Each structure stands twice: as structure tokens, then as C-alpha cells.
């Protein structure tokens with residue numbers, strides 16, 4: 116069934132689950148050709164597969180070569196996503212396989228369900244939550260590994276850095292979605308907010324800066340002000 | 353021509369015989385139907401005047417025996433039975449024929465409707481769908497469920513249609529997920545035709561029987577089966593040319609015969625719009641599309 120605001124704590128219970136976002140799988144630049152027609156050039160993409168309890172992110176990089184000579188690429192991308200998620204589940208020991216997979220766009224439901232017929236006990240679900248996982252490519256270290264890749268490749272991250280040492284997964288998810296929402300609404304400002312203090316660095320083995328508890332509250336406030344600021348610029352309120 | 357003799361008509365009832373219906377009043381001197389065309393299956397069906405709940409009836413072929421109908425006052429319905437004593441049967445039938453107590457199947461000589469609805473329906477295949485093999489005729493009613501409906505509850509009183517499920521391992525070859533989901537030709541041609549039905553005549557026979565049971569009994573699971581079987585063909589990129597042509601003919605006469613006033617509960621808007629306008633065979637069913645558009649344009 117659909118995941119929404121009524122059953123939101125289910126994300127953080129002890130049943131293994133993954134979110135799958137396919138927004139950034141098939142990415143193109145659109146340009147004019149010499150003859151003045153339009154054509155696309157594809158660039159590297161990625162599947163964003165995330166355990167919201169642990170922060171474990173399975174970043175499957177989608178190299179442009181996987182589109183070569185294929186037709187109807189927007190449709191193929193949903194099936195390529197479903198094929199790679201199925202491949203991931205099969206590669207995991209049984210006790211690590213998810214009990215549920217939540218897709219962020221409903222168009223992923225059939226492709227994934229078809230690829231996972233072999234796993235009838237894994238529930239494939241949509242969600243009414245609008246999650247900002249498309250902004251994942253505003254995270255510099257993630258964007259860099261996607262663009263540098265010369266072959267298909269899976270890279271594993273913890274998108275919560277070390278936060279779970281200090282906060283619950285519910286709070287770490289809330290932080291993450293507010294950070295991603297901010298980067299999605301105004302990327303420049305969000306990054307400005309995150310780095311304006313050169314004395315807070317990003318550890319080589321982390322994605323986000325090493326903010327103290329107190330500094331995270333400030334940062335969170337500034338991000339909410341930004342999302343409100345942009346809402347105001349947008350709708351003229 | 354053959355005859356179905358009735359012991360009596362003790363309760364008021366609407367009787368149907370294939371695509372015809374007539375009313376019999378309580379204790380009216382009714383003793384059956386005569387002049388039934390030899391050569392086709394037939395169905396004789398019932399709706400009680402005091403309880404339109406439970407339409408029910410019997411599929412039969414007069415070439416396979418001498419059958420008759422008697423009211424059973426314990427089970428409360430008109431039952432088909434077989435008289436094995438041929439002498440007794442001819443004797444029984446000739447007296448009612450002489451006293452003119454039998455209505456005549458109105459087999460118009462310019463009409464092929466029944467043939468066109470039953471072209472591929474044979475008793476042998478009906479008896480595989482409806483299991484009750486001590487009788488040579490087969491009982492169906494409004495509320496019988498299908499084997500697939502039981503999966504989703506008595507197996508003796510079920511309709512054993514072939515299960516069709518587009519998101520099932522049978523429908524989808526490992527490694528051809530996208531291909532086999534978006535183009536059902538493997539499922540239609542290799543799994544169903546070559547593997548289960550063996551030929552297209554058996555597949556069309558089940559299709560036609562599913563429609564007839566939906567229409568005559570309002571059997572909801574038969575209606576699902578008819579739509580599923582259509583959609584599998586229309587959703588297959590590769591279908592033999594002769595099946596598409598015959599399918600167009602099958603459907604044309606089903607649509608032509610459907611009561612206008614039952615169209616809302618017998619026709620699935622999604623399947624038909626998909627089949628006629630989006631599917632691989634959107635342009636391959638000229639006769640059916642033309643009749644659907646002129647008869648049920650609301651649904652489209």
C-alpha cells in the first residue's frame with residue numbers, strides 16, 4: 116500500500132526497507148544541432164537506493180553506454196532501474212534483504228514488481244510523500260563519483276555520516292530531507308549556508324560538514340528560512 | 353431437430369434457450385422446447401419470478417443423450433436429467449408434441465447468430481471447465497467462482513478457466529522482464545497456445561464460453577476471463593493473421609448480441625479502450641471497432 120504521513124514511523128522500525136528513487140537515472144542535455152534541429156546528449160546518472168533506518172545508500176552509477184542504440188530511453192530507464200535493484204537484492208545475504216521497497220514515483224511500481232516476482236514476500240509500495248531525493252546530485256561527493264565514472268559501478272555511502280551516534284534515525288531522516296529540499300529549491304544558497312564557515316570542514320570520509328549539535332540547529336534554521344524565503348520569492352507573498 | 357420435455361412448470365420462471373427468453377406462469381401447461389437445432393451446443397437457463405437471485409442453467413448437446421427438465425421441490429430449482437430409456441423418451445415427447453404443449457425454438461433460416469457465438473464451443477471443452485462428470489450436461493449459475501477467484505471457495509462448484517495473470521512468473525521469462533511485460537507474445541503463443549490450449553480453436557472456445565456465461569448468468573468471473581483473454585491477444589505484438597481476423601469476427605457478434613442495457617456491467621472500459629486504441633492490435637479489429645463505436649460510444 117501507499118506510504119504517507121499516518122504511518123511515517125514505520126520507516127524507522129526494525130523491518131529492513133529501501134527507498135528507490137529513479138529521477139537521476141536517465142539524464143540529458145538538450146542542444147541545437149548544426150542544422151538547427153534539437154538532439155539530446157546523455158550524461159552519467161545514478162539510482163538512489165537508501166535504507167532510511169541506517170543511512171546506507173547504494174548508489175548505482177548509470178554510465179551513458181547503457182543507452183547506446185536503445186529506443187524509448189525514458190521507459191527503458193524505469194526497467195533498468197528495476198533490473199539493478201533486483202540485482203542488488205539478490206546480491207545481499209538473506210537476512211539483509213529488504214522486506215519492503217518504496218518507490219518514489221508510481222511509474223516504478225510495475226517494472227519493479229515484474230523484476231521481483233521471484234521475491235513474493237517483498238512488498239513493493241508507492242508513497243504519497245514528496246521526497247527531495249532528486250537533489251542527491253547537489254551533494255558534491257556524490258555528483259563527482261557519478262560524473263567521473265567510466266563504467267557501470269556501485270558505490271556505497273552512509274548519507275547520515277556519523278549522525279546516528281547522536282540522534283535517532285527519525286531525526287537524521289528529517290535533517291536529510293530538509294537539507295535536500297533546500298538544495299532542491301535554491302542550490303547556491305543551500306551550499307553557501309553549508310560552507311560559509313571555513314572552520315567547519317567535511318571529513319574525507321563524510322558528505323556533510325562536521326557541525327556540532329548547536330551548529331546543526333542553526334544550520335537547520337537557516338535552511339528553513341531559505342525554503343521559506345524561496346517560497347516567498349516564488350509566489351510573491 | 354431435438355427436444356428438451358419438462359415434467360411440469362410448478363413455479364413461475366423466465367426460461368432462456370441460447371439468445372432467446374420467454375415467461376412461464378406458475379402451473380401453466382408447459383412441457384418443454386422442441387425443434388432444437390442439432391449440431392450446436394445449447395444452454396437452457398432459468399430466472400425464478402419470485403427471486404431473480406440466482407440465474408442458473410445447463411449447457412448440453414442433444415447428440416450426447418436424451419435430456420429433460422423437472423422441478424425439484426426440495427432443492428427449489430429446475431433440474432436437468434437424462435432418460436437412458438430411449439423408447440420411454442420418444443413416447444413421452446410424442447404425446448406432448450401431439451397435445452402441442454411444447455414451444456418451438458424459433459430457428460430463423462436467415463440467422464447465424466447462435467453458430468457465430470458458439471463456433472468454437474464444444475461440450476468436451478465445456479466439461480473440462482465445469483467439473484461434475486457424472487452428467488453429460490453442465491450446470492452454471494450467477495455466483496459460481498473461478499479457480500483464479502478462489503486463489504484471490506469450494507473447488508467442486510468452481511469454473512476451471514485457465515488462469516491468466518500478466519504479472520506472474522508464467523507470463524514473464526527471466527531476463528525478458530520489460531520485453532515480456534510490454535509485449536505479451538511469449539505468454540500468448542508459447543505458454544498459452546502451444547502449451548496449455550494446444551491450438552487457437554480451444555482458446556477461442558474458452559473465450560466464447562466465458563462471454564456466454566457472463567451474459568446469460570451475470571457470472572462476474574466469466575466476465576473477467578473474457579476480458580483477460582481478449583487483452584492478452586490485443587497486447588501481443590505477434591499474433592497469427594488468422595486469429596486476429598477470427599477474433600474480430602468473434603467479438604463483433606458478441607458485441608452485436610449484448611443487450612444494450614447490460615453494457616455498463618458487462619464491458620470493461622479500460623480493456624476495450626486499451627484494446628481498440630492503444631494496443632498492438634488497435635488497427636486489426638475493424639469490425640469490432642466499428643460496431644463498438646456506433647453502439648457503445650459512451651464507453652469510449
Ligand SMILES: COc1cc(CN)ccc1C
Nearest residue numbers: 357358359420435441444
Ligand atoms: C419430462 O420428461 C420425463 C419425465 C420423467 C419423469 N418425470 C421421466 C423421463 C422423462 C423424459
Ligand SMILES: COc1cc(CN)ccc1C
Nearest residue numbers: 372373374455456457458
Ligand atoms: C414462446 O417460446 C419462445 C418465445 C420466444 C420469444 N419470446 C423465443 C423462443 C421461444 C422458444
